[PDB]
Design a protein around this ligand. Structure first.
Ligand SMILES: *[C@@H]1O[C@H](CO)[C@@H](O[C@@H]2O[C@H](CO[C@H]3O[C@H](CO)[C@@H](O)[C@H](O)[C@@H]3O)[C@@H](O)[C@H](O)[C@H]2NC(C)=O)[C@H](O)[C@H]1NC(C)=O
Lengths: 49, 49
């Protein structure tokens, strides 16, 4: 997969005390082959180290 | 500590205020073109004192 858009981040602006969502767009890289994205098989990890 | 005075007019009457300053410090405030109240961001075409 390639990141194929900007990464958007939403917060309780302007107060910035609380975090709402992140949105971004992905597509199979260089148009070569299909990707299984079933949520049983695939993981998405998130770390703010 | 350091003291200076300034006058404002209220009900057409001059009111003198005495400002006492503990240490040298700077602050900023909006002068024009600032719709982003709450943010601390000066947008392009804003004017900041
Ligand atoms: C700013 O406000 C002051 C008080 O709010 C005022 O002073 C009062 O005014 C008179 C005395 O005449 C003053 O006038 C000249 C020019 O304004 C001053 O430079 C001068 O030092 C005199 O003080 C008096 O009735 C009253 O007691 C004064 N009060 C105090 C607290 O001083 C100022 O006139 C006014 N303007 C300026 C430029 O300072």
């Amino acid at each position: 997969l390639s990141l194929s858009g900007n990464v958007l981040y939403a917060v309780n602006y302007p107060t910035n005390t609380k975090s709402y969502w992140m949105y971004f767009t992905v597509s199979p890289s260089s148009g070569v082959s299909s990707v299984d994205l079933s949520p049983s098989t695939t993981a998405i990890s998130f770390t703010a180290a | 500590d350091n003291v200076f005075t300034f006058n404002i007019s209220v009900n057409g009457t001059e009111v003198e205020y005495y400002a006492y300053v503990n240490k040298t410090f700077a602050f900023t405030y909006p002068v024009s073109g600032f719709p982003l109240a709450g943010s601390d961001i000066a947008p392009a075409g804003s004017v900041i004192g």
